[PDB]
Structures are given as C-alpha cells and as structure tokens.
Design a protein around this ligand. Structure first.
Ligand SMILES: [Zn+2]
Ligand SMILES: [Zn+2]
Ligand SMILES: [Zn+2]
Ligand SMILES: [Zn+2]
Ligand SMILES: [Zn+2]
Length: 146
DNA sequence: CACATCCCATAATAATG
DNA sequence: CATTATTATGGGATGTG
C-alpha cells in the first residue's frame, strides 16, 4: 500500500504513479530536459515544459482571440482564457473576506488583492529596506534609486 | 506609491494513450 | 513507458488616483 512520499518532512500521499514520480524529481531537482538554444541552458522536469518554453525562442503563439477587432495571440490556452474576460466581463474569482465581496478577472489578481486586507508587504527593497505591496511598486522605487 | 489590471511564463495537478 | 490538458502560481509592465 505504497505511494506515500517518505522524505523527512513531507508526509504526502498520491494516486497516480506518474504524479508520484514527478514529486520525487522535485525533491531531487532532477531536471533532465535541457533547452538546446544557444545561450539559454534552462532545464525542466518534463518534456512538455521544454516544448512550451521553446515558444519563447521561435515566437509561436497558437491560441488566438476571435473577438472582432482583437485577434491577439497567446502562447498558452490558459492565458487566452484569462484574456477573453476583458470582452466577456466575467470576473469569477470572488474575495471571501467578511465585508468586501469584490470579484476579479484573474486568479492572481485576487491573490494580489488579499494583501490589501492582510496589510502585509512581502516585497522588500534590497537597498533602503522599504516594504511594498506589489513587486512592480518595488521595481519603480528601484528605478528611482539608480 | 498603492492598487487593479492585462500580459507572460513555469510549476503542479490530473488523467490518459 | 509515454503524451495531453488544465489549473495553480507568480513575476513583468502599465495607467489611474
Ligand atoms: Zn515529498
Ligand atoms: Zn531556452
Ligand atoms: Zn481579445
Ligand atoms: Zn477583498
Ligand atoms: Zn530603496
């Protein structure tokens, strides 16, 4: 009755043998799929990730928005699915805070919103020490330094 | 500068051939 | 063994107030 990870602090259990094999590779950092483009040298855990990474070198964007007048092209279906919400107005990711009730178009936009309630500032400036809500805010303060 | 917002890319999960 | 699909994740870039 195996398929429980046995590394020291993990205590996780799996269902599919391939997902189990993936998990073990992350513990070992076993990245056997290497990008052959000159000067890149990045590596990945599975062949699928290398194939998607290649689109950063050959410019393929196979997923197109069919909104009239838009025709924008994206490297993953998931990104196109997010983009389409600017034409549909769908905001399916809802803030479950007590009195907020705000919705968002992207899952990650909700993540960046939850720090407004928690009040945390996870992004730090390595020079001065100021603390920022988002990384982009930290970077425009870095452009003020240099 | 704090945000929401739209764009970009990889990690992890899940299931199938 | 292998491939495919979708979600989860999070940084980059920007325009408003
Ligand atoms: Zn583990
Ligand atoms: Zn590469
Ligand atoms: Zn569009
Ligand atoms: Zn909220
Ligand atoms: Zn600073």
């Amino acid at each position: 009755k195996k398929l429980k990870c046995t590394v020291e602090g993990c205590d996780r259990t799996f269902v599919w043998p391939a997902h189990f094999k993936y998990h073990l590779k992350t513990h070992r950092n076993d990245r056997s799929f290497i990008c052959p483009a000159e000067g890149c040298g990045k590596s990945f855990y599975v062949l699928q990730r290398l194939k998607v990474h290649m689109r950063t070198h050959n410019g393929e964007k196979p997923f197109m928005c069919h909104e009239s007048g838009c025709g924008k092209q994206f490297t993953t279906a998931g990104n196109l699915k997010n983009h389409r919400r600017i034409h549909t107005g769908e905001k399916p990711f809802l803030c479950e805070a007590q009195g907020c009730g705000r919705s968002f178009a992207e899952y990650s936009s909700l993540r960046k919103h939850l720090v407004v309630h928690s009040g945390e500032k996870p992004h730090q400036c390595q020079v001065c020490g100021k603390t920022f809500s988002q990384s982009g805010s930290r970077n425009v303060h870095m452009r003020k330094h240099h």
